A paper describes a structure:
Proteomic analysis of ES products of adult [name] revealed that the most abundant proteins are members of the venom allergen-like protein (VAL) family, and among the major ones is [name] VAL-4 ([name]-4). There are >30 secreted [name] VAL proteins (HpVALs) and these proteins are characterised by having either one or two 15 kDa CAP (cysteine-rich secretory protein (CRISP)/antigen 5/pathogenesis related-1) domains. [name]-4 has both palmitate-binding and sterol-binding cavities and is able to complement the in vivo sterol export phenotype of yeast mutants lacking their endogenous CAP proteins.
The first known [name] structure, [name]-4, refined to 1.9 Å is reported. [name]-4 was produced as a homogeneously glycosylated protein in leaves of Nicotiana benthamiana infiltrated with recombinant plasmids, making this plant expression platform amenable for the production of biological products. [name]-4 shares a conserved C-terminal extension with Na-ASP-2 that has two strands, which are stabilised by two disulfide bonds. The amino acid residues in the CAP cavity of [name]-4 are more similar to those in the amino terminal CAP domain of the two CAP Na-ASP-1.
Author numbering:
A (entry chain A): 2 to 189
B (entry chain B): 3 to 189
């Protein structure tokens, strides 16, 4: 599920944190039980399972390599700079991902449109229903640690801000020959 | 710690909670804790926190039903997290880091060090005159609840100051205070 050989300064423990965090968020949106600011997100039809992409992880790694964020702009990308602390790497990674979702919970999703909002831009990239690939990276840059995820597909702003379509769990039709896996997420 | 109660927590996460708080507080006291721009502090009357099993009880009780219901006896910080398949210490660490990162998103006004609801958890953690904290967490299926209870905190509107600007180791808020080896006040 990973197999990323490169000089990426990361091993699979944090990659699994990244990957399963995304797919847990997406499963609970699809099931209609992820908590909004008030109430719940979802259910969503067309919410696809994410797979790791080593190419996208390289894009994530390259954007923070110099210790100043510089995205390649080939793919949607979420980024945050956190204070480096004397705790394990899973803690920074976890803190970033939790923070990305708390932005959403602090501001609140309109669950009629499920539109992107700049105040939870990272959550929108993480929840974008029709994406199927993610790659993330982090780098300690002295007093700060940069954490960033890159996605194959994302919202297209401003015209197409919808993060996911309201619909029944396991309705998987956005790609031909899609099935719903045991995670309650679509795959193709 | 010595918290005997049915608190569903052991001392390893208690230490992460406590040490994290006192690191932040001493970095503010020394004037080296990063703000959004620049640094926070130095602060006078920044007291070291001690654990309180009573406050931990108040924390544990507010979340044991998996819906947040504070007792409202003491200032309290709370977050509902997405559950992660990581050791509990790392979920606690991630939460505490996240609480500080809110502050650096909005930024503290270092002329006033005023409370800001947008970083309420950092504010509760940084409140200089508090000396006791109790924290708890509970895995609730897909989500995890994490919360800290403080004996003292800001009082709005009358006392919005998280800490007062001033020299490290000035410890006069309470009589018979001293500055310990952590450069934090205690009595
Ligand atoms: C990704 O890298 C991290 C950081 O190196 C790995 O986590 C570390 O894994 C090592 C073991 O390979 C842990 O060390 C050992 O800890 C135990 C308990 O104290 C002791 O028996 C042993 O003496 C100790 N070794 C030494 C010399 O210290 C280490 O504690 C652990 N965490 C950190 C922050 O260093 C990680 O390994 C994965 O996670 C650990 C927790 C184990 O489950 C391990 O089997 C896993 O592979 C690396 N991930 C991968 C996939 O390799
Ligand atoms: C609190 O609960 C933790 C989870 O059960 C304990 O960690 C576990 O300790 C085992 C040895 O007793 C060790 O083999 C396990 O890998 C470890 N599990 C995890 C997820 O870390 C913890 O014990 C403390 O921490 C571990 C890492 C060791 O250093 C122990 O010697 C420690 O006591 C429990 N804490 C206490 C104070 O009992």
């Amino acid at each position: 599920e990973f197999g990323c050989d490169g000089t990426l300064e990361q091993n699979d423990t944090t990659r699994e944190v990244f990957l399963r965090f995304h797919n847990d968020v997406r499963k609970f949106i699809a099931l209609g039980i992820y908590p909004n600011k008030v109430g719940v997100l979802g259910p969503a039809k067309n919410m696809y399972q994410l797979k790791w992409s080593c190419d996208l992880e390289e894009e994530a790694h390259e954007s923070i390599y110099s210790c100043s964020y510089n995205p390649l702009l080939l793919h949607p990308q979420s980024y945050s700079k956190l204070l480096s602390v004397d705790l394990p790497d899973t803690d920074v990674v976890g803190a970033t991902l939790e923070m990305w979702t708390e932005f959403m919970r602090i501001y609140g999703v309109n669950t009629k449109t499920n539109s992107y909002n700049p105040s939870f831009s990272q959550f929108a990239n993480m929840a974008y229903s029709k994406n199927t690939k993610v790659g993330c990276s982090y780098k300690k840059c002295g007093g700060d640690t940069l954490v960033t995820c890159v996605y194959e597909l994302g919202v297209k702003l401003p015209s197409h801000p919808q993060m996911w379509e309201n619909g029944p769990t396991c309705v998987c039709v956005a790609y031909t020959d899609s099935i719903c896996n045991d995670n309650n997420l679509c795959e193709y």
